[PDB]
């Protein structure tokens, strides 16, 4: 039933390394059986029930079973389970390629479109056919078999390379060693740190270590070495992968009839073509140039003063290892924001509480934590999501907030169960997992403001994953265009820059006292600080991502150095290879990194024109946003759903206004 919880979360995290391996094989046998059954049907015998519905039903059964196998590589504390989960993921990816490239299926899906009365079948059923046929042409099923078999070889290679690329970065354990004097101006961070022989400390290259050093450490030489180590992670092994991966992407795109990989991938996005991306990025890059110059000039003066005051040598430039440091000093001077003070007001429990209350109230939902929930780690917690008005049970979400050995290093959201229809006719309960890495509680976990913003960001995907209700699994949850998928996440970040919202999220960890109104005004005002260089940095990464996928006789590190010089104005350091660490290139954002900035235009347009106009906690606007932007999922195009919400096509006005500008 759609109003209950019992037995709707099919997932289990008990699985041994042997259980995964055998379930992988069992799942392939079960799933292939359906594809064989549809393939054996004669061309005349094909109908909605025996072809379209058969494939749609096995997609639900497959994707659910698959997450029990492919998800434990990111969260299981057992290393042998992670290896089996990874190997299952490689195998099932090779299985996906085989099933996607079935010529007999494609032949029967095409025939079902021409003959069937498309008006008498639902809009989302027409969409399933339109996309299945489109994917068939994108897999080259119209081409000759010898060309298909070549495309198949390269796609199985490309899959393993992509998985290897990001696993190398996850498995990395590189560390440098420094003394107390060398880690100067870092807070008593130093105590939560491992000692070696010679009274020296171990610094990992993980985000909780790297960024505090680059932001706070006042010895230039240790920032320099940390930055060198960070931008050479997996340099040899991941340069080798990129040198294979990018030409293969080009060669496959050429065989499918596209000039480049970027053209191939842009067709499935709301931006449509690479010409619109290039114009979007170049136009925005031009508007930020004056801010970038102004901010580069203040940082450089500030460096000359600090080099004078401390008596260091002054090289007359901003190095990559100076940028985050003097951007932090810029915030402290111009907005009086000490991040290590301010985090005392954001204990993890008060932020979690505030976050969950905000979006219960806004989206008209009710959350309840489940006691003695079945989880993959003791510290992970489960919640059930209800509609409040009807009491309909929409979904569940796991929260996995604290770091450990073997866990995924960065912030992410995973769809575990789709919110789709079953053969039964009932709604499947949506399930999601929020995976982030904040410190853990003898002092409680204190979140920096960007950690709260990351928390809010990722919970936008959780809400998108759960509120989405579609007929078919492939359109469910967050399965939207990649340059649209960051709309729901980036819009919720706006609630972390509002004064009243921030007061609800904050409380001092000892006193219980609120953040002073003065400092609360300055925090909201500091949204604009360093915005030129932060946005120019994102433009560089977007431009590089495009450039690497538009011609593959460029050196990737050179191309990165080029845009760092021309756009950002801060040079990449000789010997580094930032692209070799650029895990978005292998994690389904290939030729699609512009998507962040592209969707931010839409998120800001929605926030200013509708939420900020009629009050940001208004349940009627929040229900509209839920119904028109979250609920449809991938069952509608991104720009149609924007049109339904905004009552018009979007524009940059609000987004431009968010940065300053005009």
């Amino acid at each position: 039933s759609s109003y209950t919880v019992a037995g709707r979360n099919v997932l289990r995290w008990d699985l041994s390394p042997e259980q995964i391996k055998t379930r992988t094989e069992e799942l392939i046998v079960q799933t292939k059986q359906v594809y064989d059954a549809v393939g054996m049907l004669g061309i005349e015998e094909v109908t909605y029930e025996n072809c379209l519905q058969a494939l749609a039903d096995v997609e639900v059964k497959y994707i659910v079973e698959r997450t029990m196998l492919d998800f434990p590589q990111h969260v299981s504390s057992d290393k042998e389970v992670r290896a089996a989960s990874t190997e299952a993921d490689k195998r099932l990816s090779r299985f996906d390629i085989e099933m996607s490239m079935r010529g007999d299926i494609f032949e029967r899906i095409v025939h079902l479109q021409e003959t069937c009365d498309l008006g008498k079948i639902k809009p989302e059923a027409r969409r399933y056919l339109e996309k299945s046929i489109k994917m068939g042409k994108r897999n080259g099923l119209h081409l000759p078999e010898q060309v298909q078999n070549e495309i198949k070889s390269m796609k199985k290679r490309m899959s393993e390379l992509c998985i290897d690329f990001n696993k190398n970065l996850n498995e990395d354990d590189t560390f440098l060693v420094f003394s107390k004097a060398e880690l100067g101006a870092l807070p008593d961070f130093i105590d939560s740190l491992e000692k070696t022989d010679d009274d020296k400390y171990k610094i990992t290259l993980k985000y909780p270590h790297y960024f505090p050093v680059m932001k706070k450490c006042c010895i230039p030489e240790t920032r320099r070495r940390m930055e060198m180590a960070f931008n050479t992670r997996c340099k040899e092994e991941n340069t080798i992968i990129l040198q294979q991966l990018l030409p293969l992407r080009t060669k496959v795109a050429k065989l499918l009839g596209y000039s480049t990989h970027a053209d191939f991938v842009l067709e499935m996005n709301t931006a449509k073509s690479t010409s619109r991306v290039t114009a979007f990025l170049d136009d925005l890059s031009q508007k930020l140039k004056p801010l970038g110059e102004a901010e580069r000039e203040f940082i450089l003066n500030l460096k000359k003063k600090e080099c004078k005051d401390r008596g260091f040598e002054y090289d007359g430039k901003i190095n990559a290892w100076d940028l985050y440091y003097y951007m932090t000093q810029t915030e402290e001077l111009k907005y009086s924001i000490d991040q290590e003070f301010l985090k005392e007001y954001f204990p993890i429990e008060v932020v979690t509480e505030g976050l969950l209350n905000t979006y219960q109230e806004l989206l008209g939902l009710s959350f309840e934590q489940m006691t003695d929930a079945h989880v993959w780690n003791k510290s992970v917690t489960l919640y059930t999501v209800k509609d409040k008005a009807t009491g309909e049970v929409l979904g569940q979400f796991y929260l996995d907030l604290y770091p450990r050995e073997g866990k995924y290093n960065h912030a992410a959201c995973f769809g575990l169960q789709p919110g789709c229809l079953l053969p039964d006719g009932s709604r499947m309960m949506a399930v999601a997992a929020l995976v982030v890495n904040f410190s853990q509680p003898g002092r409680p976990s204190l979140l920096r403001h960007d950690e709260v913003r990351t928390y809010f960001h990722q919970f936008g995907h959780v809400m998108h994953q759960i509120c989405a209700q579609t007929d078919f699994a492939r359109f469910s949850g967050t399965n939207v265009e990649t340059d649209f998928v960051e709309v729901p996440s980036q819009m919720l970040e706006n609630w972390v820059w509002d004064v009243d919202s921030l007061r609800r999220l904050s409380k001092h960890y000892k006193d219980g006292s609120p953040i002073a109104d003065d400092l609360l005004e300055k925090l909201v005002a500091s949204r604009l600080v360093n915005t030129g260089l932060l946005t120019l940095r994102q433009i560089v990464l977007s431009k590089v991502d495009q450039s690497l996928h538009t011609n593959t006789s460029l050196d990737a590190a050179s191309e990165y150095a080029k845009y760092c010089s021309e756009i950002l104005g801060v040079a990449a350091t000789p010997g580094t290879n930032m692209p070799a660490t650029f895990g978005h290139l292998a994690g389904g954002y290939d030729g699609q990194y512009y998507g962040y900035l592209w969707s931010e235009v839409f998120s800001m347009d929605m926030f200013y024109s509708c939420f900020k106009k009629e009050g940001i906690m208004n349940p009627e606007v929040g229900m509209k946003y839920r119904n028109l932007i979250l609920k449809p999922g991938g069952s509608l195009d991104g720009m149609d759903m924007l049109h339904n919400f905004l009552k018009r096509e979007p524009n940059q006005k609000a987004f431009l206004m968010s940065r300053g500008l005009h």
Binding site: H74, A411, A412, F414, H584, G588
Partner: peptide, 4 residues
């Protein structure tokens, strides 16, 4: 797959 995954959403960061």
């Amino acid at each position: 797959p995954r959403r960061p």
